[PDB]
Design an enzyme around this catalytic site. Structure first.
Site, mmCIF file in Angstrom:
data_model
loop_
_atom_site.group_PDB
_atom_site.id
_atom_site.type_symbol
_atom_site.label_atom_id
_atom_site.label_comp_id
_atom_site.label_asym_id
_atom_site.label_seq_id
_atom_site.Cartn_x
_atom_site.Cartn_y
_atom_site.Cartn_z
ATOM 1 N N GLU A 1 35.001 55.332 35.052
ATOM 2 C CA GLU A 1 35.243 55.072 33.638
ATOM 3 C C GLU A 1 36.560 54.310 33.510
ATOM 4 O O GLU A 1 37.637 54.874 33.733
ATOM 5 C CB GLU A 1 35.223 56.369 32.827
ATOM 6 C CG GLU A 1 36.050 57.516 33.378
ATOM 7 C CD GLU A 1 35.806 58.803 32.611
ATOM 8 O OE1 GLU A 1 34.998 58.780 31.659
ATOM 9 O OE2 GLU A 1 36.404 59.840 32.963
ATOM 10 N N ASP A 2 36.439 53.008 33.232
ATOM 11 C CA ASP A 2 37.491 52.021 32.977
ATOM 12 C C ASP A 2 38.792 52.239 33.748
ATOM 13 O O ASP A 2 39.883 52.119 33.180
ATOM 14 C CB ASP A 2 37.768 51.898 31.465
ATOM 15 C CG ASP A 2 38.391 53.146 30.838
ATOM 16 O OD1 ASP A 2 38.697 54.129 31.535
ATOM 17 O OD2 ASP A 2 38.578 53.134 29.603
ATOM 18 N N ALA A 3 38.692 52.541 35.038
ATOM 19 C CA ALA A 3 39.846 52.575 35.923
ATOM 20 C C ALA A 3 39.955 51.244 36.664
ATOM 21 O O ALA A 3 39.086 50.376 36.556
ATOM 22 C CB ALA A 3 39.743 53.742 36.909
ATOM 23 N N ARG B 1 30.616 48.418 25.989
ATOM 24 C CA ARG B 1 31.625 47.871 25.092
ATOM 25 C C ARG B 1 31.191 46.574 24.422
ATOM 26 O O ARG B 1 31.837 46.156 23.454
ATOM 27 C CB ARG B 1 32.930 47.643 25.857
ATOM 28 C CG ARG B 1 33.597 48.921 26.329
ATOM 29 C CD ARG B 1 34.902 48.631 27.045
ATOM 30 N NE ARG B 1 35.667 49.849 27.289
ATOM 31 C CZ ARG B 1 35.535 50.611 28.369
ATOM 32 N NH1 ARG B 1 34.657 50.287 29.308
ATOM 33 N NH2 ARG B 1 36.275 51.703 28.507
#
Ligand SMILES: [Zn+2]
Ligand SMILES: [Zn+2]
Ligand SMILES: [Zn+2]
Ligand SMILES: [Zn+2]
Lengths: 1114, 48, 67, 116, 45
Positions: free
Chosen positions: A733-735, A917
């Site tokens: 998750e968005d790392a 997104r």
């Protein structure tokens, strides 16, 4: 370069910004106050007098700020970059010219000092006005600073642009439960704050007001203004052939109930029940107290004799109260943007200055007669001596009201607080968007999400994509790029001009004809009752477009009612748009070419009549076209430039229309937290906390916005080489994961600097403070704390500091409050130390140290630290399109993949965000980047346009790569190719604030509070965090019964109390003190927070009688 | 109820008032001056 | 500030080329894209290092303490 | 101030691990744990007026306030020493100003007082 | 020594203590400390 008016209309927008920049809302309002509004205050406070010695008078002729009249030089002024380094106010003195009766003869004296008012920089009164990068280089100030803010006593603050509803106008309203009301506030400029309510009690119309004891039905107050015949009223209110006559018919019979029937008897009915204000004379006539009761109300209009126009102004007000009762569709919101008057600072500090000046010229007046009540001190006495004692009230009243953003008004009795805010130097654009932001009034409609939302009548008025979230969700908004506010001029010539244009008068027309025709409403007031407005209004535009009348006028003209509206109140929103006459526009590209020659600016277009300013109310009537390819023979007011609906803080996102709309609102709050470079003199300024980036980079896919604000001249952030792919599982998750080589190459190495200061204080016993240091031990001066303390006691510039290690020594006398003994007996050794110790878990350096003096002769010490750091994992990054990112892991370059050319990606991101997104902007920027990289040409990603795709892939394939750029690469860890293709390229990534090096906190067992003995809330207060009530209930949901006891009093609040058994209350160390035998005492323990609990309820008459049992022997 | 010492209704209006300890109303020193910012608990009791 | 000594991506040295890349622009007015291809920089990971370096040491030196 | 084992007179507050305990260097026994942070009337009236008068001409002659505060105690002792009675109130305090003006070694003369 | 230098006059002043706060050759009232002679150790990473 074949110029045309098809795609070169953009080039006149810089011609707007060049002559007329972005600080219109602050500079011009401050300038118009200094230039014009200073005279219009002092003339209404003239001729101070005294009752004793009646033949004495003082009058001032004129006032000036800045230079004298003898020297007539520009000025001699401290520099503001110098003034911020001494914690002083950057201000300018006011000179007044006075004449008075000295004695035998009257005397006129000039250039009298009364105070020093602050001036915001880049005004025409400051020394930074129109420099040439050499005088300002001599004054070491960054020319790319916009300015527009005060430098009072150190800190730099700014007035935020406040607003309220449209004052001096009425509004319609409906409520189901409590009837429907008609609010109408009026605030004339002399002490008047009046709001009128037209209520509906069970079908009966009234008027309540906070100067009248009760409500009055309207059938009285129309006869009190003269209009009595009672057939005129329904002819005015209702008209003919409707249901309005049926609804209004209740109010007619109540005049028969009161039996008044005439104009004379109608007055004193009000004055019987009037809330009578004490005038201390009380002449009251019982004829004139009601005449003034028809004067101090509805303060838009005041009538000398007739009361005729004021009557019809009530009839206009009570007409729509029945239309709203006929149907609830006719009502309106107070959230429409035309019902708002935004207002600037220069005419708002005019209210602040006139409060102080009226408070000035009566305290000085109280001094005069105190001298004039003497026989001897009335001939040779001069009053110019007593000026300077009273002059201090202004300047201290200035700087305190600007530092502390709260304003104690007197004529309005109102306490708007928080009006000033310290500006953030976190980013270059962070200080830009705070100049252009709006703060609401929070009128306590917290339940309704109506004003929380965004109105559709905002397109081009102000920016729509920058609005914060959280506690401030929709009450703070931001300016667009093309925006001007209006200003008032006058209502006197325009009411003469409409009579020439062929409108009638209110005192001549029949009342049947006004409902048949329309009506000219001047700020909501009918005066002429126009017929056929289409001839009337179009002849007015030709006066305005040619420029016989001012351009800040709106000719809003509705059709739900029979009315047209004129507005010149000023302080309302607008924007300019070019006039389109017919199926051809007024473009005239030869004039657009003559612009680029350089003699035909933006100003001459409205002077000729090629452009005019439109508010939202003129956007009711107009039919703005999108493009030149969209022209209809019924189509006016072509839209000048489509991407001007976003400000400079919303403008820097490349291709916003491809991206999702909530992903644009997220970045504008975070772009203000992106670190980088700030100013040109940033290595010279000494401010509280500075993040600096070593190597910034101007982004590849540019915008028309950033080149209009020169954002590329000082960027913030840099471009990586992004390979979007899953890798090692550390980005789920968005790392983000980057390479261990490129950080050693210097990718993202920031710098942290922090100011701290001390002041050497002088005491009443004439004792200073000393900086003696380096006490010695074993042939060497420095202690482990004293290696960096210098020869003078001031810590030496050139070396690091570690934890401990006093860097500023300071010693203070121990007789800090003792009386001065007029002798010299024992003052030789009184200095106890108060040294300054470097905290922090990491060793830093100093940057540099200065010393100076204050405005008063008191020593100033300012040192600023310095440390750089490398972004290890955990640090927060973003994507300029609303993708936050935390560093997952930092692996080697051999672990990263590589293309055929060996190009190692800087970072990798997971593919699992772009479908969720819906962010297309990165997907185009990489295409617009890499082909622009291989072409070497920087590309424009703007809103509603920009660089296209099909022409960019042709360059990308001529270089020999993938047409979509999704390349193939090898593996770093096993060598061979990978079964998919890798979307690879360079993407501009900024570094945010909120790094982990100053967010690691942990407290084991430290300080406790005084009243609770709890761990102290605050990271700088050495922490200890609150396990709250919502987390408390989850423990019982596990049923655990011992760590619930342990983490709530054992780990936090353990305290041992001995308690008595019979008449059971606590005692102290070994006593009972309520049956004083001290025998039946039980040793146990409670929470300390429980110990204070039944002590505070014992303070009032409550006895917590405690009863015990043993645990055992069930 | 009866049988208790304080069971009269006479003790249900203020005739005497106890003073709480100073731990409940701490004399906090804000260190803006060498004088202590004394809390509102004492000065209301002082006017009593 | 000034040009980084190496490329952030690959690590080849670019400190002898900033004056050279500027030299090919004042005299010999040339396309900037083919300028560094003549200079010998083929990799597009290094093209970003010199195209987009804002050289702000020139604006910083004017605020010297030494007049 | 005195230990229970070594009876030392030197105590050192350790802030290395944010515990802020108090301990001596001799033996190492803690001193205290869990620190508890601090989270006539006619004579009064005749100086309350005299406070206004000291503040008056200091605003006129641009006197910084660490003299006007310091000069009040010079007025305070001569108030006790019966110097004020009989003499004019305006005359005595301006003489009291120049004492602190001389002790602070300022540019301020004496006729600047008397001309006002 | 290499004692205190002015802001823009840039003049080395070893001004004796508790005496003045201004500079020579100028009326300027903000003072700069000059850097020490003592060596300082750094890394190269
Ligand atoms: Zn008991
Ligand atoms: Zn490279
Ligand atoms: Zn000990
Ligand atoms: Zn100098």
């Amino acid at each position: 370069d074949e110029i045309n008016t098809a795609q070169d209309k953009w080039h006149l927008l810089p011609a707007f910004l060049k002559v007329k920049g972005l600080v219109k809302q602050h500079l011009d309002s401050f300038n118009y106050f200094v230039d014009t509004d200073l005279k219009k205050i002092i003339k209404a406070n003239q001729l101070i007098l005294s009752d004793v010695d009646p033949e004495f008078y003082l009058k001032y002729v004129d006032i000036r700020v800045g230079k004298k009249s003898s020297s007539s030089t520009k000025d001699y002024l401290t520099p503001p970059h110098e003034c911020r380094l001494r914690d002083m106010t950057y201000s300018a003195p006011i000179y007044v010219d006075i004449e008075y009766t000295r004695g035998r003869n009257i005397i006129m004296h000039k250039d009298v000092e009364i105070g020093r008012m602050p001036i915001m920089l880049r005004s025409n009164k400051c020394i930074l006005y129109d420099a040439d990068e050499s005088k300002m280089a001599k004054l070491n100030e960054c020319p790319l600073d916009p300015g527009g803010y005060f430098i009072v006593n150190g800190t730099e603050k700014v007035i935020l642009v406040q607003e309220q509803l449209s004052k001096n106008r009425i509004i319609v309203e409906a409520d189901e439960k409590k009837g429907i009301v008609q609010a109408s506030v009026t605030s004339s400029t002399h002490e008047r704050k009046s709001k009128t309510y037209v209520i509906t009690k069970n079908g009966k119309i009234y008027l309540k007001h906070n100067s009248i004891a009760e409500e009055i039905p309207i059938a009285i107050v129309l006869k009190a203004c003269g209009i009595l015949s009672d057939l005129e009223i329904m002819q005015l209110v209702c008209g003919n052939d409707s249901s309005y006559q049926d609804i209004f018919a209740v109010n007619l019979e109540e005049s028969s109930k009161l039996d008044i029937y005439t104009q004379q008897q109608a007055l004193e009915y009000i004055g019987a029940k009037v809330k009578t204000m004490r005038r201390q004379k009380l002449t009251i006539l019982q004829e004139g107290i009601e005449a003034i009761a028809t004067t101090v109300i509805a303060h838009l209009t005041v009538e000398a004799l007739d009361f005729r126009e004021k009557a019809l102004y009530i009839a206009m007000m009570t007409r729509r109260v029945v239309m709203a009762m006929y149907n609830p569709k006719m009502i309106d919101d107070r959230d429409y943007v035309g019902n708002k008057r935004l207002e600037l600072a220069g005419q708002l500090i005019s209210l602040l200055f006139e409060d102080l000046f009226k408070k000035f010229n009566n305290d000085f007046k109280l001094s005069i007669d105190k001298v004039l009540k003497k026989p001897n001190r009335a001939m040779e006495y001069d009053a110019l001596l007593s000026i300077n004692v009273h002059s201090n009230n202004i300047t201290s009243g200035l700087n305190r009201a600007i530092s502390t953003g709260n304003w104690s008004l007197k004529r309005f009795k109102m306490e708007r607080a928080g009006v000033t805010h310290v500006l953030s130097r976190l980013s270059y654009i962070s200080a830009l968007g705070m100049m252009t932001r709006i703060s609401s009034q929070f009128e306590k409609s917290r339940k309704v999400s109506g004003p929380r939302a965004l109105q559709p009548s905002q397109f081009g008025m102000l920016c729509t994509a920058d609005t914060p979230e959280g506690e401030a969700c929709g009450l703070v908004k931001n300016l667009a790029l093309m925006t001007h506010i209006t200003t008032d001029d006058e209502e006197e010539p325009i009411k003469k001009l409409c009579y020439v244009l062929g409108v009638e008068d209110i005192t001549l027309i029949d009342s049947a004809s006004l409902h048949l025709n329309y009506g000219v409403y001047l700020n909501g007031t009918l005066i002429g009752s126009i017929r056929f407005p289409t001839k009337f209004v179009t002849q007015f535009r030709h006066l305005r477009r040619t420029g016989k009348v001012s351009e800040f006028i709106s000719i809003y003209s509705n059709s739900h009612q029979m009315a047209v509206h004129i507005a010149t109140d000023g302080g309302r929103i607008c924007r300019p748009l070019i006039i389109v006459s017919d199926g051809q526009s007024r473009v005239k590209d030869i004039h657009l070419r003559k612009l680029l020659d350089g003699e035909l600016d933006f100003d001459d277009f409205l002077k000729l009549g090629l452009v005019e300013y439109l508010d939202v109310n003129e956007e009711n009537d107009s039919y703005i076209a999108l493009y030149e390819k969209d022209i209809v023979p019924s189509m006016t007011h072509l839209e000048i430039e489509p991407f001007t609906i976003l400000g400079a803080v919303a403008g820097l996102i490349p291709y916003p229309h491809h991206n999702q709309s909530p992903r644009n609102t997220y970045q504008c709050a975070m772009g203000k937290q992106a670190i980088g470079a700030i100013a040109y003199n940033q290595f010279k300024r000494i401010d509280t906390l500075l993040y600096l980036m070593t190597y910034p980079q101007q982004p590849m896919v540019k915008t028309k916005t950033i080149e209009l604000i020169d954002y590329d001249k000082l960027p913030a952030g840099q471009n990586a080489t992004v390979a979007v792919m899953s890798y090692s599982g550390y980005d789920i998750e968005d790392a983000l994961v980057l390479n261990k080589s490129s950080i050693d190459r210097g990718f993202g190495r920031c710098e942290t600097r922090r100011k701290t200061t001390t002041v050497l204080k002088r005491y009443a016993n004439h004792t200073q403070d000393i900086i003696g240091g380096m006490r010695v031990d074993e042939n060497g001066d420095p202690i482990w704390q004293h290696q960096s303390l210098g020869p003078d006691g001031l810590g030496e510039v050139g070396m690091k500091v570690q934890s401990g290690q006093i860097y500023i020594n300071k010693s203070v006398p121990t007789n800090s409050a003792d009386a001065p003994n007029p002798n010299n007996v024992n003052v030789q050794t009184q200095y106890r130390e108060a040294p300054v110790i470097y905290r922090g878990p990491e060793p830093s350096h100093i940057d540099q140290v200065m010393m100076s003096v204050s405005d008063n002769d008191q020593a100033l010490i300012k040192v600023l630290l310095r440390q750089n750091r490398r972004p290890e994992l955990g640090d927060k990054f973003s994507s300029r399109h609303g993708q936050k990112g935390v560093c997952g892991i930092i692996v080697k370059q051999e672990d990263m993949p590589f293309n055929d050319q060996g190009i190692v990606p800087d970072i990798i991101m997971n593919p699992h965000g772009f479908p969720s997104r819906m962010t297309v902007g990165k997907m185009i920027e990489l295409i617009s980047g890499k082909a622009g990289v291989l072409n070497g040409t920087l590309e424009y990603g703007t809103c509603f346009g920009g660089s296209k795709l099909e022409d960019m892939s042709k360059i990308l394939v001529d270089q020999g790569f993938n047409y979509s750029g999704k390349d193939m690469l090898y593996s770093g860890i096993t060598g061979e190719c990978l079964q998919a293709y890798i979307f690879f390229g360079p993407i501009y990534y900024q570094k945010l604030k909120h790094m982990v090096l100053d967010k690691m906190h942990a407290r084991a067992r430290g300080p406790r509070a005084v009243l609770t003995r709890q761990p102290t809330e605050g990271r700088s207060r050495d922490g200890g965090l609150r396990l709250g009530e919502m987390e408390r209930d989850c423990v019982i949901a596990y049923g655990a019964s011992q760590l619930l006891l342990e983490r709530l009093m054992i780990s936090s609040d353990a305290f041992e109390v001995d308690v008595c058994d019979k008449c059971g209350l606590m005692g102290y160390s070994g006593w009972c003190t309520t049956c004083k035998s001290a025998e039946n005492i039980i040793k146990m323990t409670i929470p300390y927070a429980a110990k204070l609990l039944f002590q505070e309820l014992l303070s009032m008459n409550i006895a917590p009688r405690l009863r015990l049992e043993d645990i055992f022997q069930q | 109820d009866a049988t208790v010492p304080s069971g009269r209704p006479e003790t249900y209006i203020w005739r005497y008032l106890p003073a709480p300890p100073v731990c409940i109303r701490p004399s906090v020193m804000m260190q803006d001056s060498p004088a202590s910012n004394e809390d509102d608990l004492t000065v209301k009791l002082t006017e009593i | 500030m000034i040009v980084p000594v190496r490329c952030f991506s690959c690590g080849k040295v670019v400190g002898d080329k900033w004056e050279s890349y500027l030299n090919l622009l004042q005299e010999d007015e040339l396309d900037e894209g083919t300028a560094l291809s003549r200079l010998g920089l083929k990799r597009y990971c290094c093209r970003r290092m010199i195209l987009t370096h804002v050289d702000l040491i020139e604006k910083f030196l004017r605020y010297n303490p030494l007049e | 101030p005195v230990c229970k084992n070594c009876h030392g007179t030197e105590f050192e507050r350790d802030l290395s691990n944010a515990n802020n305990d108090l301990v001596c260097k001799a033996c190492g026994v803690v001193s205290e744990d869990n620190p508890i942070v601090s989270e006539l009337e006619s004579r009064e009236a005749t100086l309350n007026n005299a406070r206004r008068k000291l503040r008056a001409v200091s605003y006129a002659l641009h006197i910084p306030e660490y003299i006007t505060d310091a000069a009040f105690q010079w007025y305070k002792l001569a108030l006790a020493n019966n110097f004020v009675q009989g003499r004019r109130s305006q005359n005595v305090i301006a003489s009291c100003l120049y004492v602190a003006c001389r002790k602070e070694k300022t540019h301020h003369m004496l006729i600047d007082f008397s001309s006002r | 020594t290499l004692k205190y230098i002015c802001a823009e006059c840039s003049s080395k002043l070893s001004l004796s203590r508790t005496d003045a706060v201004r500079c020579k050759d100028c009326g300027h009232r903000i003072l700069l400390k000059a850097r020490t002679k003592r060596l300082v150790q750094f890394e190269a990473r």
